[PDB]
Design a protein around this ligand. Sequence first.
Ligand SMILES: Nc1ncnc2c1ncn2[C@@H]1O[C@H](COP(=O)(O)OP(=O)(O)O)[C@@H](O)[C@H]1O
Ligand SMILES: [Mg+2]
Ligand SMILES: [Mg+2]
Ligand SMILES: [Mg+2]
Lengths: 265, 29
Amino acid sequence: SKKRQWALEDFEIGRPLGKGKFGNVYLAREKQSKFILALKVLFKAQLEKAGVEHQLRREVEIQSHLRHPNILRLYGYFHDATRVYLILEYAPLGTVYRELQKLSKFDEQRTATYITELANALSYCHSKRVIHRDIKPENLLLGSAGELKIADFGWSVHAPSSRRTTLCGTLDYLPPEMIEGRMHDEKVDLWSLGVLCYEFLVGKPPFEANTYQETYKRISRVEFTFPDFVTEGARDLISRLLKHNPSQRPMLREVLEHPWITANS
Amino acid sequence: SYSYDAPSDFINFSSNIDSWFEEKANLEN
Ligand SMILES: Nc1ncnc2c1ncn2[C@@H]1O[C@H](COP(=O)(O)OP(=O)(O)O)[C@@H](O)[C@H]1O
Ligand SMILES: [Mg+2]
Ligand SMILES: [Mg+2]
Ligand SMILES: [Mg+2]
């Protein structure tokens, strides 16, 4: 490129917005236009020791080319001698994770609204053959109007044709097919959505156990129950998303038309 | 190596990309 490239000197850095595994995400303002955004920092030495350099590249290439109202925007990136920087769209209201600690549980209206935004977001993603694979409260942010925005494409992949073999994601959200050493596809995000919907309503993931081994066991068996306040419609939906057989889980278009979703969304 | 097929050019924030996926899926060799 013969064009001016990004540089750290281009942004005034503000306070930290969050703590990531390989560095913090700071609020920031581009100096010439005063546009407010978020700066995700990654320390290169940490990335090298972890051997996650190829996943960083997939995060950047996949997220930067995605364009949707409920997916966090990746404007660009730049690296220097010790770290790598992602120029992200600023999410003003924080994470759904934080809102979930505060409210402890989400009522049905709030839960269906979020599921709907996320389901629309995932549908657009799949139409591009991208599988997120790390859907969870800490990766869901809130925009200026309280609208959900999917973020963190760290474990994402572009799967045009073939299935995948990677185990990746968060323990409580892992799909059975991954744990069991089987191949997987975009249906893993449908499982994540069921896990996520349950957590929104109950306040905790359905397979939470005291050890790693016990959680693997419960996911593989799809062992969980609902507290008494979870209505019939929510149970019908989560039960359909949480099918051991990936083929039997609903399409995102079905979730969006689910009676419970349309009545409360 | 930190050379990614993604944007790195300075942008003027005051003043259709997703085809990249299918176009890369359809390319041959
Ligand atoms: N654009 C953003 N706006 C506000 N907070 C963010 C933003 N990006 C990340 N964060 C905060 O940083 C945390 C961690 O960074 P994230 O990019 O989600 O993944 P990782 O854990 O791999 O770093 C999030 O859980 C969130 O609290
Ligand atoms: Mg499809
Ligand atoms: Mg994250
Ligand atoms: Mg990450």
